[PDB]
Amino acid sequence: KPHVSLIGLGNMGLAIANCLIKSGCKLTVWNRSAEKAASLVPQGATVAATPAECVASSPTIVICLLNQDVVQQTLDEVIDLSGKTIINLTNGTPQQAVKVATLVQQRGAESYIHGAIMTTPEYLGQPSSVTLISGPKTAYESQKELLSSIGTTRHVSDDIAKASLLDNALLSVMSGVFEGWVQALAIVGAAGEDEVDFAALASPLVASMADQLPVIAGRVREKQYVGGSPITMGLEALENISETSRELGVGVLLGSMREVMSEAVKKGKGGESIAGLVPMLTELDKKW
Amino acid sequence: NKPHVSLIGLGNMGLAIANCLIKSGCKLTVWNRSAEKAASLVPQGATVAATPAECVASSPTIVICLLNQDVVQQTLDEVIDLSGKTIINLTNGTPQQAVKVATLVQQRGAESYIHGAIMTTPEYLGQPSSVTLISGPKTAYESQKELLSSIGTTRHVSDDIAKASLLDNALLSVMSGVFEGWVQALAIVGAAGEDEVDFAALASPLVASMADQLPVIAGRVREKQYVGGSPITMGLEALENISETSRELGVGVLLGSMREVMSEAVKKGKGGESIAGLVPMLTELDKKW
Ligand SMILES: NC(=O)c1ccc[n+]([C@@H]2O[C@H](COP(=O)([O-])OP(=O)(O)OC[C@H]3O[C@@H](n4cnc5c(N)ncnc54)[C@H](OP(=O)(O)O)[C@@H]3O)[C@@H](O)[C@H]2O)c1
Ligand SMILES: NC(=O)c1ccc[n+]([C@@H]2O[C@H](COP(=O)([O-])OP(=O)(O)OC[C@H]3O[C@@H](n4cnc5c(N)ncnc54)[C@H](OP(=O)(O)O)[C@@H]3O)[C@@H](O)[C@H]2O)c1
Numbered sequence: 035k036p037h038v039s040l041i042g043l044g045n046m047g048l049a050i051a052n053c054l055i056k057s058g059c060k061l062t063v064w065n066r067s068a069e070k071a072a073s074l075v076p077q078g079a080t081v082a083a084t085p086a087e088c089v090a091s092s093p094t095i096v097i098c099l100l101n102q103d104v105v106q107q108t109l110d111e112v113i114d115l116s117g118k119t120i121i122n123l124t125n126g127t128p129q130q131a132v133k134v135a136t137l138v139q140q141r142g143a144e145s146y147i148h149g150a151i152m153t154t155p156e157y158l159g160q161p162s163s164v165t166l167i168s169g170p171k172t173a174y175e176s177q178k179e180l181l182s183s184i185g186t187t188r189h190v191s192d193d194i195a196k197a198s199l200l201d202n203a204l205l206s207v208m209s210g211v212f213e214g215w216v217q218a219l220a221i222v223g224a225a226g227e228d229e230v231d232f233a234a235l236a237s238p239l240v241a242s243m244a245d246q247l248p249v250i251a252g253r254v255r256e257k258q259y260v261g262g263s264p265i266t267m268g269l270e271a272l273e274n275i276s277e278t279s280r281e282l283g284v285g286v287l288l289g290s291m292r293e294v295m296s297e298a299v300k301k302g303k304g305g306e307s308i309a310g311l312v313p314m315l316t317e318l319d320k321k322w
Numbered sequence: 323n324k325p326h327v328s329l330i331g332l333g334n335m336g337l338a339i340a341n342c343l344i345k346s347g348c349k350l351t352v353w354n355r356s357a358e359k360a361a362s363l364v365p366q367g368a369t370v371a372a373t374p375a376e377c378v379a380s381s382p383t384i385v386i387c388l389l390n391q392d393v394v395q396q397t398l399d400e401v402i403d404l405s406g407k408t409i410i411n412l413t414n415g416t417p418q419q420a421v422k423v424a425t426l427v428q429q430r431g432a433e434s435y436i437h438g439a440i441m442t443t444p445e446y447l448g449q450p451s452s453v454t455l456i457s458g459p460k461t462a463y464e465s466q467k468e469l470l471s472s473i474g475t476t477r478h479v480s481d482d483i484a485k486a487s488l489l490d491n492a493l494l495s496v497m498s499g500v501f502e503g504w505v506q507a508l509a510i511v512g513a514a515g516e517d518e519v520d521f522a523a524l525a526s527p528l529v530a531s532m533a534d535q536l537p538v539i540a541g542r543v544r545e546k547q548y549v550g551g552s553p554i555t556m557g558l559e560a561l562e563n564i565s566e567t568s569r570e571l572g573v574g575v576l577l578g579s580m581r582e583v584m585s586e587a588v589k590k591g592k593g594g595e596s597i598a599g600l601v602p603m604l605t606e607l608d609k610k611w
């Protein structure tokens with residue numbers, strides 16, 4: 035059986051551990067809270083006392099910690115990475131991926147690849163569950179069979195930072211959808227409506243909007259901001275969402291969207307489509 | 323002969339309604355504050371009324387599509403007599419605004435008032451895939467159903483006049499969040515030198531995974547089930563990394579209300595809960611996040 039080490043046994047790390055044991059790995063684990071390995075012990079996992087001991091146990095090291103600062107802290111006293119391949123599945127920024135890749139290279143690592151898991155723990159290991167991988171193609175090819183334990187991989191780039199770039203863009207879309215969905219369900223529930231019946235009404239209309247995301251992308255690329263749905267009109271609709279909510283005693287999200295649309299109107303872009311908001315963001319480092 | 327219909331409002335959506343009503347065979351009379359927006363309708367046989375009152379006198383059915391319900395109310399200050407008139411109001415507004423305008427139209431003697439929420443853009447109006455939600459008296463809806471088929475498929479959601487606007491506001495909340503996240507995503511990948519169209523293709527099946535989990539979250543919200551494998555603490559860390567990814571590229575960042583409500587959920591002891599746990603954050607407190 036191939037020896038694999040895993041650092042991190044949180045919600046996603048434990049799911050990774052179970053996938054690696056099911057695929058036939060000899061697994062060594064480490065977690066700050068060592069008790070999170072308990073369900074792995076009857077399955078034959080070994081628990082390392084320290085990160086260094088965990089890394090010493092295997093030639094392939096998978097990491098899945100909260101963030102890349104925690105990865106750097108955890109690898110602090112891991113002096114010898116010669117012969118080791120690092121597979122980092124920890125969310126972070128593009129430059130954080132560069133920082134961790136450089137750290138492990140300085141300690142003699144053979145390769146670093148980054149992955150962004152685009153599913154939740156309970157679906158990890160299913161073929162529909164995608165993980166985006168970035169890093170040298172030779173390293174991806176060497177790890178692809180091990181990685182198939184967690185589902186389908188997609189090699190998106192040889193640049194080690196690109197999985198995190200794409201992760202952050204995809205999680206932006208997901209965060210916006212969830213912000214809008216939480217607002218919608220708060221309104222519907224406070225009004226005495228049934229959330230499940232509402233979802234049956236809303237899901238197909240969301241599917242339609244999903245099919246326009248590509249249309250918007252092309253217009254953004256081509257700087258085409260003229261259409262039939264101007265920002266002034268969308269902002270009026272958002273102000274009515276606030277008031278609908280307030281009347282029901284419900285709080286309101288979507289404030290950054292109101293603020294960037296309001297400023298677009300002040301700047302003379304009120305007749306533009308929401309594509310016109312993209313340059314509002316790219317031209318200024320500001321939290322709206 | 324062609325049935326007479328009047329339309330108040332010739333903006334982006336009002337002009338698209340006008341064209342649909344003309345294509346379906348109506349004798350259309352229109353009014354708009356900026357009267358020149360009727361110019362493309364005149365060669366098609368539309369009549370232009372001087373005033374809102376003259377527009378309403380011209381037909382038994384009056385469609386309204388104005389910016390907001392305050393503009394509808396300002397226009398109704400100019401319309402005293404709605405005897406023999408059915409009003410179809412397709413103006414976005416709040417549930418209470420719909421109740422108020424229904425009362426104003428009743429005081430003017432209207433036969434009926436129905437409210438509609440158009441859930442598409444102007445260029446798609448008239449397609450049978452395009453949905454408009456309708457609320458108000460079912461007899462009035464059934465009498466207007468053939469006329470309304472000019473703008474696509476209608477769905478009568480409730481006899482309660484406020485319901486189309488309640489559902490519109492909730493659906494537009496979802497759409498606004500989708501757009502907010504998509505603008506952020508496109509700004510990041512554009513600034514990074516990536517192609518937006520290729521990103522949309524890469525994103526397609528992943529956005530699909532996201533859109534199938536909306537009914538799952540709804541059921542969890544209804545049943546108050548907030549425990550899962552994707553805690554708010556972890557999601558908040560990912561959102562903080564979106565801000566820093568954006569800053570590394572010189573790009574601004576949206577999603578602030580989401581970061582704020584999630585931070586407060588952590589303060590209230592809900593950091594281990596799922597997204598569904600944010601819904602009671604909103605229903606328990608009138609606050610702008
Ligand atoms: N869960 C998901 O749905 C999901 C989906 C896709 C990707 N991911 C990504 O997977 C990564 C892990 O997420 P998760 O859901 O497993 O989060 P989690 O359940 O909160 O687990 C966090 C992990 O980080 C460790 N950790 C946190 N702070 C630490 C510190 N100061 N020192 C040492 N260890 C520390 C935790 O150790 P303890 O056990 O000792 O607390 C635990 O192993 C994140 O980057 C996340 O974005 C998660
Ligand atoms: N994608 C869309 O465009 C879309 C989708 C679904 C629903 N809707 C809804 O349709 C309604 C109309 O939207 P739209 O896109 O047509 O907006 P629009 O192009 O901005 O048109 C606004 C309309 O309201 C009129 N108006 C504004 N302020 C006025 C005032 N103070 N007094 C008199 N008239 C005034 C305008 O008259 P002037 O021409 O004289 O300015 C124009 O007729 C809104 O409630 C919107 O939410 C729009």
Ligand SMILES: C[C@@H]1CCN(Cc2ccccc2)CC1=O
Binds near residue numbers: 151208212556558
């Ligand atoms: C599809 C999964 C969902 C869990 N992850 C984080 C997350 C972020 C915000 C809200 C819930 C979960 C990202 C994913 O890729």
Ligand SMILES: C[C@@H]1CCN(Cc2ccccc2)CC1=O
Binds near residue numbers: 271272442443494497
């Ligand atoms: C489906 C159409 C798309 C334009 N929407 C305008 C809008 C609303 C909120 C935020 C941005 C744009 C309204 C709609 O109903």
